[PDB]
Amino acid sequence: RPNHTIYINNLNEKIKKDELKKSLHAIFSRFGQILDILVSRSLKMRGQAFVIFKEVSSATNALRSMQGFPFYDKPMRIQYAKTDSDIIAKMK
Template identity: 40%
Template sequence: MPHGFCEKELRAYFSQFGKVLNVKVSRSTKNGHAKGYAFVKFKYAAVAKTVAETCHNYLFFNKLLKCQYRPLEEVHPRTFVSYPWKPDLKRKRQHNNGKSEGKLRTSLKVYTKKQEGKLKKLKEIGLDIKLSDILDVPKSRESPSKTPQTKTKTPQKKENNSASKTKETTKKVVKRKQTLSTKK
C-alpha cells in the first residue's frame, strides 16, 4: 500500500467498484503508522472477487497493489472493529519510570565488560589506563545516614572575572600535565 493511502482514500477508490461496507488499515501499536496492508469489506462477494482480479498487481503510486479475495469465514470476526489509536499507556509508564536497581546493575556490568575490553586493546597499544579512572561509580545507592547533616556556606571573596578564569585554565593545564605524566 502506498504511503498516505489510508482509510478515506481506500474507501473513495474502491467505492467505484461497488458498495464498500468497511475499511481497515492495519497500524503499528507503537506509533500508529500504517503497516502496509489493509482490508476492504464489500456488500457483495461477487464485487469483491472482481476487485481482487482487476486490482491485483496494479501499479499504484510506484507501488504494486496485491489484492486477494478472502471469504468472510476466513477473516477474523473482529477485523473491522477499530478503536481510536492512543499510545499504549503501559509502554508510556514503563518508559517514564526508568530502570530498576537490577537492570541498572546488569547494564553497568555490561558497560564495564565493554570498557575492560577496550582498555585491553589500549594496553596492547601502549596506553596504561585503569577502569577506575574512567568510571566514577558510587559503591551503593543506599539512602544517606539517618542523622541529618547540615551544610553551612562560608562567605567567599568576590574575585575579578578575568583573574578567576585564568586560575581555572591554569588548574586544567596542571591536571592535564599530571594525567599525561601518569599515563606514560
C-alpha cells in the same frame, strides 16, 4: 476461495492512516458497496489493508481488475481474506 473481504499488502508504508483509508475507498467504491475498511500501522499490520464489500461478487471483480494497480507508487497485491470479517460473521 472468494470472500466478501479482500487482503491488500505491499502498500506504501509512508502513507497516513486517514489518507490511505479515503484513497482506498475511492478506488474500490466503483466495484460495489463497502461495509468498512480496516487499516492499522502497527509493526505487524502495516503496509496492508482489509476492504469489506457487501457483495461477494464485488470483491471478486475488485480483486481481478485492480490487482497490481500502482497505488501510491506501489503495485497492489490483492488476495482474498483467508477468514471472514467480524462484521460479516455477526451478520449472516
